Each structure stands twice: as structure tokens, then as C-alpha cells.
């Protein structure tokens, strides 16, 4: 009934989907192959898995996910991995060649042959479920299929779905470190074409999670698997109210109407607390006030930015585990009385809190400590105007000299699209400045 189809796009999307589905199967008791482990809940049906799993006549739990990469490498690793029997074969369609960090190639020439297949699979997965809540779409702004094909997917989903929620989990580029070089072009283009087609885009920037793993988890060299596990915990804390019993239940349709003030500003920031390791979680208790202060601390966001230099629009606090509403109220009131946290003037009341009793699930071999309670904060604030302006300057430095434009011109795209994307992000920066006055 509370079904959510997860569409993972690109290498980043496929890998974070691997971590997410490992966490989902572990917390719902599904064996990796396809089933419940025999004697576990013989009399108890325990139909909480229906959000993320479907039941067939063979008694096999099948996830409601679509894994798409235009390169058949990560999808082949999934198909030959430990979860080779969990996934339906047609839920993991793939292309023959990748976009190779090219929005025009991923959107106009080789993204037009996988879009029909992915929309047919999405149509089948939507007609299979009764009462779809929304699409959890996991991708990266870094370029390629995560910027071109994902945006084409949202453009088609706007046509044939409409009012259904479209929650993005987007890898945002780092202020300092990078992998590609045309990713400013890719980000500007994909933001211009997803501004009017998405609903709420949670920024899960990689450099901040690197420093979070280096600081709290005491990991000198973190890796993509650790970041994927953290993003899996973030999305599990987001979606836990649709599967577990909670005092204040939140669905996917509340996040947009409580975090998107204007249709252009729909880029909130996710963060988790605590992300402490075991040898240090032994030392002190982790109460509601302490985890709320950890969320509101500047050096705990999963984007490399300081929220003290901006103004909050609206915060969402999903408390998860052994938490009580009076400690929640006391923590939020203490935060509101704190001076370094400043709200924007047109939002007098600016929190949306959801209390859930299910404790966070611990992946064996993971790094996060086991705790009674945790909290996921989804904050919409003006501080990301730094990120938008920096990324836009990086775009301008390259577009001034027409660097790497001939690829996009050759792969079926006009430079008028570049000009309109730059003007659209200029308007977005003007909006982000003009809100704060």
C-alpha cells in the first residue's frame, strides 16, 4: 500500500542502490537469494516489506527498483554479485555504450533507446502496485547518464505521471575535489532541465561525507562503500515511517509541501546524527538534545558548506528510535533560542518533525555504531547559494573560452541550450539572494 519505486541511474545510483537494498533486505529479514529464511516468522505474515518488495506466487520477494546504467559494468556486477537472484532480470536494463560524461550524448543520441524500455518497466511496476506514493530517484550531477538520462527520465515521468512525488537523491559536486572536468557543464544543464520537473532534491555531496567519516567514524581513508552505506541510512530514516509504526508518521508527499517554499527552491540538505563510531559512542550517551545539536552543528552536514552563513527556510527532523516528543520539543526550542541559528523572516514556524520508534539497523561489517536513537535532518536554507555561485563561476570560466563545447554540439545539442541554462542558473542565484532580504 505504501509502495515506493526506487529508480537508480548511473554508476553512483547503482552502487548506492546496492547498499540501500542490502540494508533494506537486512532490516526486513529478506535473505539475499529471494525469500524469508524458512522458520523466521512462520505464523507472522509481517507484511511491512510491501513498501519495497512485491510477493509472487513462488514466495519470492522482488524489489520495486529499476537499475539503469548505459555501460554494462556495474549492472553486470550486480547481476553476478551476491544478490543475483533477488532482482528481476528486466528491472536491470542497460545500454551498450555509456555517455562518458556528456549531457548531450546521454540525453539526445544514446539515451533515446533506453528510455522506452525504462518507461515500460516503470509502467509495469506502477500498475503492479496499488497506491503509489512516489519515485525515489537516485543519481549524480557529476555527468553522463546521471545528468542526461535521468533528466530525460524525469521529463517523461512528468508527462505520464504528473502529481506523483519525485524525490531525488543527488550527488552534488564538491567545492574542491573532482573526478571529471566537464561536470560544471553537466550540472548546469541538468539543473536547468530538472528545476521545473522534480519536486525535492536532497543534496548528498561526497566531500562532506569524506570529512564526516574522517572526523566522527575515525576512518583515515573512507571509500564509496562507506558513503553508500551512509546514504542508505539516510534514505532508510526518510522512508521508515511508511514501514514501521511511528508516533508522528511522515509520507513522501509531506516533504515537498513542507520543504519547498517556492517551485524554484527545492534543494534541501540531508544530514544524520549520530555518525559516531563504537569506541567513542561508548563514552557518552546520545540523547535527543545532543543529536539535535549534532544536526545543527556546521561540521556535520553532508554538503561542504556552512549553514551559519545562510538563513534557514524550513527544517525537517525525522527522529528514529527511542525518542520522546518532550525531549524533541525541548531540543527544538533550545535550537530556536540559540543565536548562531537564524531563520528567514517569512517562516515563523519552520520545522516538520516525525517521531518513529524503530531503531536504526546495523549492517554487519559496517562502521556506524549501534544506538538507541538517531535523527535525519532535511534542511532547506540559503547557504547553498555559495555552492550554486561557485559551480556557476566554474561553468563561466570554461564557457568563456568555449572549452569542451564541440562534444555537445556534435552530439545533437545547440549552444542556445547552454545560454539558456546559464541564464536559468543566473535567475536561480538571483532568487536565492532575493529570498533572504
Amino acid at each position: 500500500m505504501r509502495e515506493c519505486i526506487s529508480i537508480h541511474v548511473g554508476q553512483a545510483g547503482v552502487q548506492i542502490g546496492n547498499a540501500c537494498w542490502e540494508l533494506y533486505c537486512l532490516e526486513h529479514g529478506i535473505q539475499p537469494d529471494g525469500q524469508m529464511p524458512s522458520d523466521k516468522t512462520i505464523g507472522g505474515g509481517d507484511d511491512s516489506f510491501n513498501t519495497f518488495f512485491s510477493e509472487t506466487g513462488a514466495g519470492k520477494h522482488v524489489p520495486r527498483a529499476v537499475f539503469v546504467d548505459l555501460e554494462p559494468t556495474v549492472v553486470d556486477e550486480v547481476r553476478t554479485g551476491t544478490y543475483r537472484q533477488l532482482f528481476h532480470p528486466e528491472q536491470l536494463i542497460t545500454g551498450k555504450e555509456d555517455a562518458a560524461n556528456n549531457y548531450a550524448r546521454g540525453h539526445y543520441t544514446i539515451g533515446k533507446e533506453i528510455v522506452d524500455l525504462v518507461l515500460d518497466r516503470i509502467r509495469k511496476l506502477a500498475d503492479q502496485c496499488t497506491g503509489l506514493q512516489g519515485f525515489l530517484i537516485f543519481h549524480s550531477f557529476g555527468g553522463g547518464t546521471g545528468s542526461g538520462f535521468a533528466s530525460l527520465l524525469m521529463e517523461r515521468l512528468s508527462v505520464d505521471y504528473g502529481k506523483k512525488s519525485k524525490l531525488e537523491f543527488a550527488i552534488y559536486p564538491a567545492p574542491q575535489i573532482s573526478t571529471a572536468v566537464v561536470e560544471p557543464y553537466n550540472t548546469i544543464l541538468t539543473t536547468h532541465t530538472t528545476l521545473e520537473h522534480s519536486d525535492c532534491a536532497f543534496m548528498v555531496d561526497n566531500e562532506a561525507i569524506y570529512d564526516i567519516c574522517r572526523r566522527n567514524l575515525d576512518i583515515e581513508r573512507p571509500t564509496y562503500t562507506n558513503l553508500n552505506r551512509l546514504i542508505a541510512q539516510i534514505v532508510s530514516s526518510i522512508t521508515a515511517s511508511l514501514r514501521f509504526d511511528g508516533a508522528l508518521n511522515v509520507d513522501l508527499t509531506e516533504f515537498q509541501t513542507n520543504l519547498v517554499p517556492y517551485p524554484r527552491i527545492h534543494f534541501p540538505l540531508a544530514t544524520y546524527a549520530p555518525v559516531i563510531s563504537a569506541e567513542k559512542a561508548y563514552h557518552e550517551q546520545l540523547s535527543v538534545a545532543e543529536i539535535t545539536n549534532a544536526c545543527f552543528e556546521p561540521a556535520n552536514q553532508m554538503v561542504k558548506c556552512d549553514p551559519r552563513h545562510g538563513k534557514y527556510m524550513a527544517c525537517c527532523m525525522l527522529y528514529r528510535g527511542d525518542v520522546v516528543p518532550k525531549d524533541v520539543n525541548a531540543a527544538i526550542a533550545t535550537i530556536k533560542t540559540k543565536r548562531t541559528i537564524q531563520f528567514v523572516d517569512w517562516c515563523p514556524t519552520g520545522f516538520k518533525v516525525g517521531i518513529n520508534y524503530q531503531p536504526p539497523t546495523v549492517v554487519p561489517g559496517g562502521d556506524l555504531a549501534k544506538v538507541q536513537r538517531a535523527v535525519c535532518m532535511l534542511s532547506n536554507t540559503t547557504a547553498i547559494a555559495e555552492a550554486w555561485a561557485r559551480l556557476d563561476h566554474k561553468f563561466d570560466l570554461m564557457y568563456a573560452k568555449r572549452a569542451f563545447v564541440h562534444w555537445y554540439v556534435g552530439e545533437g545539442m545547440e549552444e542556445g541550450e547552454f545560454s539558456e541554462a546559464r541564464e536559468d542558473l543566473a535567475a536561480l542565484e538571483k532568487d536565492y539572494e532575493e529570498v533572504g532580504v
Binding site: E220, R221, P222, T225, N226
Partner: peptide
């Protein structure tokens, strides 16, 4: 992932 960031990895 203990092999990547073991503090005695290059020793051992």
C-alpha cells in the same frame, strides 16, 4: 574495509 585504513597496513 579495514585493509584500506589499518594504521599498521604498511607495517604489515
Amino acid at each position: 574495509e579495514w585493509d584500506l585504513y589499518d594504521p599498521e597496513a604498511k607495517k604489515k
